[PDB]
Ligand binder design. Structure first.
Ligand SMILES: Nc1ncnc2c1ncn2[C@@H]1O[C@H](COP(=O)(O)OP(=O)(O)OP(=O)(O)O)[C@@H](O)[C@H]1O
Lengths: 238, 239, 137, 48, 144, 239, 241, 230, 237
């Protein structure tokens, strides 16, 4: 197939294959989940460990007081995007002195990621994101995509082995709204557990949490800070 | 031969720019036709308009453009490329008027467009813009003037010309007519053009099926003809 | 496109300008049709040609459902997602996906299949050998 | 599958009935084939 | 169409393998060095459901193969197999057998009764870093 | 992966283009260098004058600065360019910091230049492997050797060019603190080193000795003949 | 035809570009979007598809406001469309700044179209993969409607449909008397048209997006207010049964 | 294998693309140039594909300056391009030195610009060849230039289609010495040698380069010369 | 493989980005290095792997001093290592100048990574060369947070690791470390274990000139190469 090597060539069926390959790249990462009540947006991530000794990779990145990010896919693209995001939020605060609405930020990210799919000269950004924020219109959980397409998801999960997570979210999608913070977090990490294989179980080492609330600046919990949430969670069904 | 020299604008054994050659086939790809004629004191352009779907503002579909108050143009071939070339021509006419202080003679404008096309074909990284153009105007002390361009950058002045799919038959018929001795009065010119188009296509078109644009020495303004007037001319041609 | 030539001539004349009645019907299947002689199809000879397109995502999911009917599949499975992932596949490949997912489940001792099993099967049939590739967290 | 078809029948799973071994030369595919032939306890047929 | 005979033979083979009513108890194995040349008809699953790829053994596999081969040899117990397995980056078990034989022959040439690590590492140099390895081997002053 | 690109890796990981570049160096005339206790010497084959040609133009040993000398092996034009850049760099460095360049600094600079040319496509790496030597302030002998890949090293004594392998083996076998006791001993060491590979030419040798901190003086052929006579006399004596 | 379609800067022996042709084929596969023009204003109707049931309502809207007095409906690669929208919005902004009044729709539709066409002239950049419509209204000029395709040709329409079932939509639009109906009544029909061509069996759930412009909105573009879309949608279902 | 890019060398000979451009030049309208004792003459065939075309619209011999003519063979648009360039160069020289450009300098400048397009890249070389008249300093000049960038200096030549026959006839007829009128007769004769169809006052273009400035001949004069035998 | 290796601007059907796996493989042909972090400090051991007696052993620089409290060990292409080391030193000095303090180990590793990530951004710092770098680094240093050991890879990823081994023979060294390490180690014990592992891995018998060792502990500066102590350390073992 000679229609596959470049991103600026249309397939005879009307497709750009490099985009599908970036989709796969996003599939290459690990799992990640996001939920939102009326008040809080909670995004949970499962982080791998390259070896036993090394410390698990970071999966949640602090972007602003009201904006938090989970990544899956290429690390380089993740870091570049995170830098872009941080810079844009800072400029908005400097010029207007107000938090940047999540939707405008996601729109900017899409407009930036689109260009590499059009002009030959750089690969499409191969990283999928979960953006959890709180603005005047309450919480938001957006999900971007290497194709420069973004979605306003009420509860979404992306990454390797995320189908089970999505099915669980849909099944219990009804009551995610009125639930409090603790219940929301419990649902999120229960979904993540569902993504985990049968043997392994969630532990205070390989799970990280991020929360942005109506009155709560974005906070990242890892290691012992996560024990309060995990403890009390229902035993894994068998 | 062909097989290697058929992807970029570079020479071939028995020097042959195949790309510019393919541009002309692209021009024919439109599926239309046009005919221009030059009279004693007038010039006429005729084209066939094909609205295939009723849900379409017939006014918005047109192939006669006004390059300048006195200079009229008709385009043929790929639509978007023709529009781009038309815009370039308008720009060049405006620039000439601004810099030198008088309306651009038709021949010079045609030359400018030809030069642009030539520079495009010489250097790579730009498609040859496969659309052909015909210009009509009135030049003081020179009478009516008709000129034609081509994507290859060649241009020339004509006494009568055709473009599009039926170019060859139309031009043969026009030559047959021209070798005959006629005065070519305004009515005569329009009748000749419409007759040539009809005979080439054998259609006996209704008054909404074709567009006409004429420039006359009495009123150098390039005026697009209206349905009533074209219908009157057509019936008169039927006698 | 000489024994084979004689045989094809025999069959052709057998079906050529003969059997005006419809009491006898034949179906000929070809893996590829570019080496079959044009005389075969002709016009009044084999004009009935049935192209078989490449199964589509909906068709692929339907095929997996068909072949998985006997299997003990947990309802959670999402055939639509599997079809979306399984690009440029055929019925045989889908059947292989089903049977080999069943094999994976048996290997791990599972009583019933699961979406992850089908994903593993799809990755396996092409022999992709999925593994953690670093620089991808 | 040949020794204990009961397990396969339980889940209604069919043996592949055919395997293609491939890889760069010298891997041992022929070695593995002869090895399994040692413990086959059934008729094994090579080819020429 | 000079291959028509082999082609028809293969077509008969594949047809008898699968299609209509096969026996269903015929376990078929196939070994080819370059499957890419194989036709679509045979490679399509159903006829050949399983695909077992035999890749180059990893480090641990190489250590295991070294231990398996060398056990019969008469050698001092102090040799580090893992070192050797590392020294052969990507080599099939055939090369491991070759280096075992080469080390034994080196020992014989020295009129010795037991092989030592030196025998093994020079054998390795012979069977791997001596055929095509000679480019950056002397000018390794690029990697440190 | 393949070789027709500087900036492409291989499944093994090599950058084949630069490995190929090293062969050009390997194909040049031999050069040798040794670092004494108070003297630094280098010698070159520099053979085969073409009957009707001058020799003052064919230069293989050149002085970068009043306290740093250099001798190369590889493509001649590339050597010329590198030498010119090194000289300009030495003077500029003395301009910005009013201290003479230490040999290590200039070796690092040259290696960086070669690496930069190795960096990207559209630029062919230098097919040159130089050999720098000299003294710096505080008067410490030093010898450095660079490679087209952009890496450099310090040696007590080393050789490059064709037959550099045999010369290197001989040096490592013979180099000892005794051989460095006096200047003449080092000169004789280098002379015999070259003799081991330059055949019995004798007149196909050019030796540049930077005695401590005076100047890079090129030995007159007669002196080389004298030293060769001494070497042969000693060889006869020990036999 | 192979060997000639790897880039948009090459001509086929038959004399035609192929990348442009491929792009058009990439748009046809998109979901439908129809727009018809009433005497007093213009109406757009889009058939957005719902995926995964997890997307918040109104996700990735396919109706945009390039300007307060202009609209846009898109079909094809959404990512590309969004890029065009910002180009349009910028294009209108410059016009107002440079001249000082709302941009005529006919002119803007031309300027944006030129942009799309310019992307099918170079081998470095692929042609756009989205076809979109434009609509506006104003007392000075009256209702207007335009359509644009990847090739970059912009004709003005009385009723247009772009997407999978453009044929079925156009077929149904023809039997409406757009030349004389009031835009309020048009809305009811547009709902019916989409539902007729929806093909619920082979596409699953969908959301009906509707857009308004006309003297009913004082020459302003805004989505049809809820409780009107509800009425039309209720009627559309009724007509189906 | 090679002969696609104007950069790489053949594995023996020379670049090919330039040779192919020369070939394109060969298959063009006939042209003839005769350097007389006291002037220069240029002639070219100018036949339209039909009677519709206007023969007074586009010319093939053009004045670069008051005393430097120019005729071409090969493609036309390139001829327009480099005639414009040559006019620019002549004007620049006049501005700098306040003196009419001597012909040789113009020829070499034009050759430089022409070879400029043969350098690397996608910029294909000119597919035309030029003959230049000129009467500076008191003696006529006739130069030829080609896409290769080399410029010769002929006494009398003919290029384009069937140039071999023209060259043979030229070396047969023109000896060394003629006036402008006899040179014109020889030139029209040479064109007729290979010209197809009856020649008229409108089929061919003729220009002269004297000690009054280069000038193109009007249809009446060319008709007169065409008459009177020859 | 099946194509897609000719550049870093093309994905694969499985999404993998070749020309990065290959760069990772590149480091596999360097001399092994080991780094162990304990409460008392960070110890780095490396196999010098000399080739010819003539060459000065010091010229083979495998363990550089990034700063008074940050040391680095590299294994891969030498030129890439040199460029990265220079970047780290420059950026440390710049940070000290602007904020008048000593930069953390994590910050230095991340600053280097930001340069290592820019393969083909087309608007990168002068350290971008289209192809990825081919060197893996180990940074060890004592900062406000105690002793820290960070590992890098050409992809740009970096990670904290208490015990690590890189370069040719990294696999076996990692396997050993995984079973000899325990959080309550003492710097002397860590050094002895590192040496025992290293010598067990290398083919050549351990010698005072074979290896290079360095250590950084809270009280002391990095500038302790244990030069001429190597003899003592080895002969105790
Ligand atoms: N552990 C091992 N793994 C693999 N091969 C081994 C091993 N130990 C020894 N070998 C030798 O490796 C060789 C691999 O050859 P194999 O059995 O693949 O046949 P072959 O002649 O290589 O055919 P092909 O090249 O097509 O595989 C055998 O001769 C086998 O004895």
């Amino acid at each position: 197939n000679q229609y596959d090597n470049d991103v600026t060539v249309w397939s005879p069926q009307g497709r750009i294959h490099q985009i599908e390959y970036a989709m796969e790249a996003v599939k290459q990462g690990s799992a990640t989940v996001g939920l939102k009540s009326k008040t809080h947006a909670v995004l949970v991530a499962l982080k791998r460990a390259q070896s036993e000794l090394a410390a698990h990779q970071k999966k949640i990145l602090h972007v602003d007081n009201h904006i938090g990010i989970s990544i899956a896919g290429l690390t380089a693209d993740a870091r570049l995007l995170c830098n872009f995001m941080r810079q844009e939020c800072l400029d908005s605060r400097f010029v207007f002195d107000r938090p940047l609405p999540v939707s405008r930020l996601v729109s900017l990210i899409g407009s930036k990621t689109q260009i590499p799919t059009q002009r030959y000269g750089r690969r499409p950004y191969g990283v999928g994101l979960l953006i959890a924020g709180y603005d005047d219109m309450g919480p938001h959980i957006f999900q971007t995509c290497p194709s420069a397409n973004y979605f306003d998801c009420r509860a979404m999960s992306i990454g390797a082995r995320s189908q089970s997570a999505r099915t669980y979210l849909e099944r219990h999608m009804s009551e995610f709204m009125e639930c409090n913070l603790n219940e929301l977090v419990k649902h999120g990490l229960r979904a993540l557990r569902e993504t985990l294989p049968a043997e392994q179980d969630l532990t205070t080492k390989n799970v990280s949490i991020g929360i942005v609330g109506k009155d709560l600046e974005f906070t990242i919990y890892d290691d012992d800070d996560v024990s309060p949430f995990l403890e009390g969670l229902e035993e894994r069904p068998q | 031969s062909a097989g290697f020299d058929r992807h970029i604008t570079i020479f071939s054994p028995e020097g042959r720019l195949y790309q510019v050659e393919y541009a002309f086939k692209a021009i024919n790809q439109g599926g239309l036709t046009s005919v221009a004629v030059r009279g004693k004191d007038c010039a006429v352009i005729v084209t066939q308009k094909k609205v295939p779907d009723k849900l379409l503002d017939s006014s918005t579909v047109t192939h006669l453009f006004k390059i300048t108050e006195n200079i009229g143009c008709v385009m043929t071939g790929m639509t978007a490329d023709s529009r781009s070339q038309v815009q370039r021509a308008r720009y060049e006419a405006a620039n000439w008027k601004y810099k030198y202080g008088y309306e651009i003679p038709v021949d010079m404008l045609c030359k400018r467009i030809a030069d642009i096309s030539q520079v495009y074909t010489q250097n790579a990284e730009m498609r040859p813009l496969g659309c052909c153009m015909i210009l009509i105007g009135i030049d003081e002390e020179q009478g009516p003037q008709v000129y034609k361009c081509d994507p290859a950058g060649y241009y020339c002045g004509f006494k009568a010309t055709a473009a599009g799919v039926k170019q060859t038959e139309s031009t043969s018929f026009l030559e047959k007519k021209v070798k005959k001795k006629f005065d070519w009065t305004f009515e005569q010119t329009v009748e000749t053009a419409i007759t040539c188009l009809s005979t080439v296509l054998s259609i006996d078109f209704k008054p909404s099926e074709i567009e006409v644009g004429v420039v006359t020495v009495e009123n150098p303004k390039f005026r697009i003809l209206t349905e009533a007037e074209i219908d009157a001319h057509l019936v008169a041609l039927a006698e | 496109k000489r024994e084979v030539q004689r045989t094809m001539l025999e069959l052709l004349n057998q079906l050529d300008g003969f059997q005006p009645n419809t009491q006898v019907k034949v179906i000929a299947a070809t893996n590829r049709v570019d080496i079959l002689d044009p005389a075969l199809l002709r016009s009044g000879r084999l004009d009935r040609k049935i192209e078989f397109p490449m199964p589509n995502e909906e068709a692929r999911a339907r095929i997996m459902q068909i072949h998985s009917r006997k299997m003990n599949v947990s309802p959670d499975v999402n055939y639509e997602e599997l079809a979306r992932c399984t690009d440029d596949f055929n019925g045989a490949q889908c059947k292989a996906v089903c049977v080999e997912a069943g094999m994976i489940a048996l290997r791990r001792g599972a009583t019933e299949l699961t979406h992850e099993d089908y994903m593993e099967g799809i990755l396996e049939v092409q022999a992709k050998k999925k593994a953690n590739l670093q620089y991808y967290a | 599958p040949l020794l204990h078809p009961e397990r396969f029948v339980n889940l209604g799973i069919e043996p592949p009935k055919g395997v293609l071994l491939f890889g760069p030369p010298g891997t041992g595919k022929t070695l593995c084939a002869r090895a399994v032939a040692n413990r086959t306890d059934a008729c094994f047929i090579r080819v020429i | 169409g000079g291959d028509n005979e082999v082609q028809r033979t293969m077509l008969e083979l594949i047809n008898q393998l699968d299609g209509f009513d096969p026996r269903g108890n015929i376990k078929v194995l196939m070994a080819t060095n370059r499957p890419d040349t194989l036709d679509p008809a045979l490679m399509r699953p159903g006829r050949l459901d399983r695909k077992i790829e035999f890749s180059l053994p990893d480090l641990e596999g190489r250590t295991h193969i070294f231990k398996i081969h060398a056990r019969s040899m008469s050698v001092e117990r102090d040799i580090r197999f893992e070192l050797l397995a590392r020294l052969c980056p990507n080599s099939t078990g055939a090369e491991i057998r070759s280096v075992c034989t080469e080390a034994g022959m080196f020992a014989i040439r020295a009129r010795r009764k037991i092989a030592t690590e030196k025998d093994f590492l020079e054998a390795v140099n012979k069977v791997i870093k001596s055929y095509a390895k000679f480019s950056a081997t002397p000018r390794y002053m690029t990697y440190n | 992966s393949y070789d027709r690109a500087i900036t492409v890796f291989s499944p093994d990981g090599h950058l084949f283009q630069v490995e190929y570049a090293q062969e050009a160096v390997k194909k040049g005339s031999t050069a040798v260098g040794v670092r004494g206790r108070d003297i630094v010497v280098l010698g070159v084959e520099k053979k085969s004058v073409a009957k009707l040609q001058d020799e003052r133009t064919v230069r293989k040993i050149c002085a970068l600065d009043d306290n740093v000398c250099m001798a190369f092996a590889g493509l001649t034009a590339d050597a010329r360019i590198v030498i010119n850049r090194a000289r300009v760099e030495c003077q500029s460095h003395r301009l910005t910091v009013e201290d003479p360049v230490t040999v290590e600094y200039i070796t690092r600079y040259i290696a960086s230049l070669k690496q930069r040319y190795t960096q990207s496509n559209g630029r062919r790496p230098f097919g040159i492997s130089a050999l720098i030597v000299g003294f710096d302030f505080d008067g410490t002998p030093r010898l450095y050797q660079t490679d087209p890949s952009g890496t450099y090293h310090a040696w007590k004594a080393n050789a490059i060019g064709r037959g550099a392998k045999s010369v290197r083996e001989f040096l490592e076998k013979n180099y000892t603190d005794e051989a460095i006791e006096t200047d003449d001993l080092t000169i004789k060491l280098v002379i015999k080193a070259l003799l081991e590979v330059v055949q019995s030419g004798g007149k196909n040798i050019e030796l540049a000795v930077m005695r401590r901190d005076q100047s890079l003086k090129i030995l007159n052929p007669e002196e080389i003949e004298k030293y060769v006579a001494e070497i042969e006399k000693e060889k006869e004596e020990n036999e | 035809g192979t060997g000639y379609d790897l880039s948009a800067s090459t001509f086929s022996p038959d004399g035609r570009v192929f990348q442009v042709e491929y792009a058009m084929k990439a748009v046809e596969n998109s979901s439908t979007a129809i727009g018809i023009r009433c005497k007093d204003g213009v109406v757009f109707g889009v058939e957005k598809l719902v995926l995964s049931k997890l997307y918040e309502e109104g996700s990735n809207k396919r109706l945009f406001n390039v300007d307060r007095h202009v609209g846009m409906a898109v079909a094809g690669l959404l990512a590309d469309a969004r890029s065009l929208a910002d180009i349009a919005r910028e294009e209108a902004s410059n016009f107002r700044s440079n001249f000082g009044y709302n941009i005529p729709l006919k002119h803007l539709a031309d300027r944006v179209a030129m942009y799309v066409h310019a992307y099918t002239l170079y081998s470095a950049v692929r042609p756009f993969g989205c076809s979109f419509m434009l609509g506006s209204y104003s007392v000075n000029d009256g209702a207007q409607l335009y359509m644009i395709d990847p090739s970059g040709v912009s004709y003005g329409y009385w009723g247009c449909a772009i997407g999978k079932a453009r044929q079925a939509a156009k077929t149904e639009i023809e039997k409406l008397q757009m030349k004389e109906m009031t835009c309020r009544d048009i809305v009811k029909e547009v709902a019916k048209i989409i539902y007729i061509v929806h093909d619920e069996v082979k596409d699953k759930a969908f959301e009906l997006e509707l857009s308004w412009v006309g003297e009913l909105t004082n020459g302003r573009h805004e989505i049809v207010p809820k409780d009107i879309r509800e009425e039309a949608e209720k009627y559309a279902k009724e007509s189906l049964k | 294998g090679y002969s696609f890019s104007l950069t790489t060398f053949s594995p023996s000979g020379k670049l090919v693309q330039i040779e192919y451009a020369l070939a394109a030049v060969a298959g063009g309208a006939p042209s003839v140039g005769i350097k007389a004792a006291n002037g220069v003459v240029l002639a070219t065939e100018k036949k339209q594909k039909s009677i519709l075309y206007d023969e007074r619209s586009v010319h093939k011999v053009e004045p670069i300056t008051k005393h430097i003519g120019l005729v071409y063979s090969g493609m036309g648009p390139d001829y327009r391009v480099l005639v414009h360039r040559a006019r620019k160069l002549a004007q620049q020289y006049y501005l700098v030195y306040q003196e009419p450009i001597p012909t040789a300098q113009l020829v070499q400048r034009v050759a430089s610009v022409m070879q400029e397009y043969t350098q690397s890249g996608g910029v294909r070389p000119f597919g035309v060849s030029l003959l230049i008249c000129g009467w500076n300093e008191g003696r006529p000049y006739l130069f030829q230039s080609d896409p290769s960038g080399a410029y010769f200096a002929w006494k009398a030549t003919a290029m384009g289609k069937n140039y071999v026959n023209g060259k043979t006839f030229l070396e047969k007829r023109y000896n060394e010495d003629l006036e402008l009128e006899d040179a014109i007769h020889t030139a029209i004769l040479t064109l007729k040698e290979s010209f197809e169809g009856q020649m008229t006052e409108d089929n061919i273009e003729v220009g002269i380069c004297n000690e009054a400035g280069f000038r193109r001949l009007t249809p009446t004069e060319v008709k007169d010369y065409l008459a009177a035998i020859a | 493989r099946s194509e897609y290796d000719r550049g870093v601007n093309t994905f694969s059907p499985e999404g993998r980005l070749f020309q990065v796996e290959y760069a990772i493989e590149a480091i596999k042909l360097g001399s092994t290095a080991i780094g162990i972090q304990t409460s008392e400090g960070v110890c780095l051991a490396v196999e010098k792997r000399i080739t010819s007696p003539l060459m000065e052993p010091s010229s083979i620089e495998k363990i550089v001093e990034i700063d008074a409290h940050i040391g680095c060990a590299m294994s891969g292409l030498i030129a890439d290592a040199k460029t990265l080391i220079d970047k780290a030193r420059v950026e440390t000095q710049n940070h000290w100048f602007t904020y008048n303090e000593t930069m953390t180990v994590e910050s230095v590793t991340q600053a280097v990574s930001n340069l290592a990530l820019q393969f083909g951004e087309e608007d990168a710092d002068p350290g971008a060369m289209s192809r990825p770098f081919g060197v893996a680094l180990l940074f060890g240093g004592v900062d406000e947070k105690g002793p820290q050991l960070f590992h890098m890879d050409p992809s740009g990823t970096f990670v904290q690791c208490d015990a690590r081994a890189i370069g040719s023979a990294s696999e076996g060294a990692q396997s050993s470390l995984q079973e000899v390490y325990h959080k309550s180690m003492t710097l002397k014990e860590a050094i002895k274990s590192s040496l025992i592992i290293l010598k067990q891995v290398m083919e050549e018998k351990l010698n005072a000139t074979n290896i290079e060792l360095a250590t950084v502990q809270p009280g002391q500066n990095f500038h302790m190469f244990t030069k001429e102590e190597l003899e003592e350390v080895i002969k105790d073992i």
